[model samples]
Target: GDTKEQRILRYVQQNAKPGDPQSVLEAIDTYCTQKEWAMNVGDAKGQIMDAVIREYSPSLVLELGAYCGYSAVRMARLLQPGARLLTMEINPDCAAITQQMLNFAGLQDKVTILNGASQDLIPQLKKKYDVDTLDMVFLDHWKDRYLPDTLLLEKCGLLRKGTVLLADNVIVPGTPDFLAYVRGSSSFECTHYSSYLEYMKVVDGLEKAIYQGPSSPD
Candidate 1:
């Protein structure tokens, strides 16, 4: 139904190697720049994403958005064997595309597509994934919802000491509240990387922070 997303699935289905995560990841990036514009965390910022994943080699990762599944494939490729990633997407159409994209990358088992609002699904992380604390999380959906979703994570006890949280488009569309919350809180140490928006020259950036967890109560 949507040409941009459909075009990406079609491209990967045709051009990318079946069951190859890196191939699918590159194909999606290619299409995003040369064929059609997609918001799936383009290669520029994604490089930083890859480096973080490499550093952690985490057993579990949670992504708040799965547009076109580029970031999903990117993370799935680097995740240690037996590691799992759960990505949430409210839009069914995008979710479906993400599923197909992961299948093409042969990462269906490593990455789970949770089709629903993160507000509802974030609470289900423990019950569903056998994960009580999120090792890493990526925020790339509605910019305004970043702080609320993060607060929800805190309330759910999903964030822990040393848990890494990465956010995209922090400067382009921007999330001022999220910036302030993470920066001001003693619970987090925050920093951002300068970058450009996908397929455009306008300034944008990615923010990375570590949750220091809550202080002990007296």
Candidate 2:
């Protein structure tokens, strides 16, 4: 466990504002380079997601977690022109920091970060974004909320028949219930991709499940 001083230092580092877009990305890059234990998707997993988006060519994307806007930058880079991504973060401070980083990465216009839990914001987003159907969804926030949040998204009409849902950190800080639910559902067909956890010594794995279905009321 980290000591009190170390924790405080980290809090200060993550909270400080870097005023401009370039400075914001630089600040995040510097923090990750100097700090040994940050989980902002890094470049490897980001490339995987980028490739997935390019192949899918989705018009709308949703990310469950936007930590310092690292993955958001990657997604923004791959999104089609005029495409938009809606990301959710439970921590207001983190959301603010990510918005700064995204602005720095030249992605502020393409990505919108919601400072709330998925459950609280999904309903409003469904109406706000006119998201009757989602083309792609990414889950990387609170592990326990994965299944419940996905179900709520489905119930709220954010997911349609052909919506693709990709969830990270499944085998690592695993979301067993979410995985089981996906596997048992008959209406959904899934493909799970396995990979090692980023920045970990232990053999932690991840899963990216792509769900394929039709676009109709379920």
Candidate 3:
């Protein structure tokens, strides 16, 4: 049974180190590009994301998606000690496999998986995890759900001033509505990083928006 995700899972068990996060990441991307195409942020945009993780050094991170868990391992490895990440995934199958992958990367301790809809799980995470003021948020879920999930974060009072939101794959299979709102909203200062999709050299991009705090002075 050569299922796409199973391939990644098998690849890691055979190639990636048990406790080395970077090696696990490399192995996943290597298998993805060399063996089969995957939705993991790939190598191109992932570099820019790596730089942001180092620069911001956010202590609390919320990832709105975790398909096969490459980005989860990437950011979990870079986060400062005492930092934590809560990543959500809608598919139980993907969620289960991702947890296994994170375990192999030795990052299960650093990340909490919310295996359900972002809309349904965001609130639960807000209460259980450190969503009081998230240092960073990454939107990498369904294109149509992006705007609503982001609004849910704001409505729950999670984002604070200087909170960074990174939206991947905004151009190809785009989340245009989410991009437009983040770019035009008075609550955030937004920028677009033009890059290619996971394994191709075509036009693609990511939207980086930093919250400017709520518009009200209260």
Tens-digit per-residue lDDT, 95-146, candidate 2? 8767766654566888878888888888897667667677899888999999
Candidate 1 global TM-score:
0.93
Task: Give candidate 2's error at residue 172 in angstroms.
Answer: 1.3
Query: What TM-score against the true fold does each predicted structure earn?
Result: 0.93, 0.79, 0.93
Q: Per-residue alpha-carbon lDDT of model 1 for 1-218, expressed as tens digits? A: 56687888998899999988877878878877785473553778878988888887677889988778888888888887888898999999999999988888888998888899999998888887677798899998888889999999999999999999999889877998999989888999988888766556677878888999795685
Clashing pairs for model 3 are none
Q: In the order shown, what is each candidate's alpha-carbon RMSD?
A: 1.7, 4.8, 1.9
What's the C-alpha lDDT at position 83 in model 2? Answer: 92
State in Å the error of residue 201, model 1. Answer: 0.7
> Between the candidate structures 2 and 3, which one is better when assessed by lDDT?
3
Q: Alpha-carbon error at 41 in model 2, in Å?
A: 5.3
Give lDDT for model 2: 0.70
Tell me the deviation in Å of residue 140 in model 3. 0.7
Ranked by TM-score, the better of candidates 1 and 2 is 1
Task: Tell me the whole-model lDDT of each prediction, alpha carbons only.
Answer: 0.85, 0.70, 0.85
What lDDT does candidate 1 reach at residue 163? 93
Candidate 3 per-residue lDDT, tens place, 1-218, comes to: 76677778889899988989888888888887786484553777788789889999999999988777888988898998889998889998888888998999888988988888999887776567646788899888888998998898888888889999999989988998898898888999998888765445577888899999877766
